[model samples]
Target: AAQTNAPWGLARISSTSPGTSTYYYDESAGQGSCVYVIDTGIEASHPEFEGRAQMVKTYYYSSRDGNGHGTHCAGTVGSRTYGVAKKTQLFGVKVLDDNGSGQYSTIIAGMDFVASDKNNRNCPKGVVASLSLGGGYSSSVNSAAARLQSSGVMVAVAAGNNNADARNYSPASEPSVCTVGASDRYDRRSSFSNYGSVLDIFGPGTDILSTWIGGSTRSISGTSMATPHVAGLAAYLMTLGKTTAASACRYIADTANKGDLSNIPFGTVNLLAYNNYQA
Candidate 1:
């Protein structure tokens, strides 16, 4: 078992206006929102992402390939055939490289672009930023994420998949962000998913089937798969009128399929329960 802690909209918010509260489900409609992957670029041409994908924005903070983790994460979040956000618009901010790593300065530049789109005229504003592949959060990452929020963008960050104390990172630990953890098909938190009150929500991250490079398929496990579940859920909730981060949080908890939070590793916190923030 594990513990939990923290935190969309369907607005056409510019990377500058942190927009409306949105949920990420609605497997029925499948494609009515937008999600940004702020990591390395994805393998855009893969069959799973072929005709269904749309590149609303792109920025290269490092040489393409940033260790491939970003693309891999993207595949899990929006690979048309296998991802959670398949029906949503996809945006890329190549901050990491083929090595799957990047400097704090580069991360800031990439986030800043998503926050403003100042020079990138072709980019649209994002409703949520899917930062699936990341390590300990840093001060810079927090500042960048905060700035994005100040501009109306919501971020769904991965809770470190270490299964240790959760106070180690910056962005993931940041209260303004929606830090996600991982659970298996049985609803048990994976041994590798870090736990602490900082985790906002949990999703199916174990043995998750998703798209990989060259149109191949792979089953990876970790908080990476879980993060997108929440993102897509946020999109779905927005469609139902849950329009703020607070309302979105409640939607997940109150509408959770498991019926009761106590039975699940990522039980509902219900921040909006007392406040009556429902839509």
Candidate 2:
């Protein structure tokens, strides 16, 4: 069960801002869900993971988190502390290298690997694929995301950090994935976060603290950080028996905090991620 404290993103998901309200959930928070962190791999031995992290596949760099971004994202998705779904199983699919760079083909291959239960990988119900990396619009990545959804996996992708229209990005612009933007502690868009019609939801990203490599914690900012919050929220919802990607997307969009973006000039939609669990 959740204790007296709450992570910032967890608080926002429960319809409150961080450091403002106390929120908690039971031990079943994410009891039967799984999440794929398709980034620079994970430090599977990190204390936050508590032995629940699995390396499903890797495109390069030996499946270990050298850059720390993927591990950070993975922690936010399923770690016992600083995560939305504190009990979800985390799987790492390393597409980015130590330099945090990856190609579309490699990313697509990673997605295909995670979507299928090939070789008895055992992707549980309510699987959420969280991607914090994005490039300029690519049909290949878009197609791959769609195929993953076809196999009943929910996908959450980052809106690029260019502060431009998210519609110009690949996975963010894709209709199948939940395109996430970053929000600050005050419920405003992050200064560097992209915004546009293609954006689906916003989550805590600015100065967000989560598990990092070397058994430490660090705070970073980006739509990349925000994406995993939505992914974790989706994983938690999956534990509630919402299995399909489309259903998870619809539930989040329908239940998000409306008008959370007051001064942003991007679009009329303001679907802010909110946690429905209470202590």
Candidate 3:
């Protein structure tokens, strides 16, 4: 049976990697994949992430999320109630500070930590990074993303919330990273979402309900929220043996429900929608 209270994003995709039939089953529940949230930080002690979330490293400030942005992003990436890969281990890598801002150098160093750390010493099973921050284009950041992708790490980045072309942003314009835009409950492009050829796909981002900093839950909106849905899906796909970024991206794109949405160039591509379970 399908879970009655699955998060709307997962429900939209019918994502059942750790579904009712095999709840807690090791292999399908993101057992060997790790999702790193390289943002403000993550509240590791939040109730929803008690066992799986940990503060593995930091680049600037402490790993305790002071701005709530990282915690919220982490929740959508892999909390039991609002996550895509419910069992994936989550690591908090503090690139941004309490003000939700960070230097480009700090962000690059954080990415290096994620890529170099092997075994459980830092981030175990590290394969994906969830980045919800945005800024102007940077060659260094873009290169880091490309290097990580070549090293078997999938980076899911938020296409800017600005209504302009996402290609104007840093990581979003990076060809190697999987850039995500936002869609509303009605399957239309979010009015604030950046749309154009730079986006890899679209996911539920408007009015998204997920965990907050104080171990609570709330609704938030943005392409920042949309990025993790794809990040978690990527990790979940890895748990199902779709290890490489190429294969996982292909699976998500090919299996996306291309129905109901009709918004010009943006609507012509893959918009994640429920299509029932496959495994």
Candidates' RMSD to native = 9.1, 1.8, 3.7
* Residue 45 lDDT (model 1): 69
Off by over 4 Å in 2: 17-21, 266-268
Choose the strongest candidate by TM-score.
2
Q: Model 3, 174: alpha-carbon shift in Å?
A: 0.8
lDDT of 1 by residue, 121-151 (tens): 3223236677775567578778887777666
Better of 1 and 3 by lDDT: 3
Model 2's alpha-carbon lDDT is 0.82
Candidate number achieving the greatest lDDT relative to the actual structure: 2
Give per-residue CA lDDT, model 3, range 1-279, as digits (tens).
245666566566564221222222233556678888888888888888858988888765366788888988999888877777777888888889888899888888888777776345433344778889878889898888777666677788888888778878878888778888888766778888887777777877888888888788888999889888888888877776655665565567666765545462643354563333554
Q: Which lDDT value does model 2 have at 217?
A: 84
Sequence-dependent TM-score of model 3: 0.88
Worst 10 residues of 3 by lDDT: 16-25
Arranged by lDDT, best first: 2, 3, 1
Candidate 2 residue pairs in clash (backbone atoms < 3 Å): 13-274, 13-275, 14-275
Residue-wise C-alpha lDDT for candidate 2, range 1-279, written one tens digit per residue:
554466666667776444554445556667778888999998889988999888878977498888889999998898877788888889999999988999889999998998784325554556889999998988888999888877778899998898899878878788878889998878878898888887888888888778888989888989999999999889888787744556787788887888766547746368788766655
Return the TM-score for each candidate structure.
Answer: 0.73, 0.94, 0.88
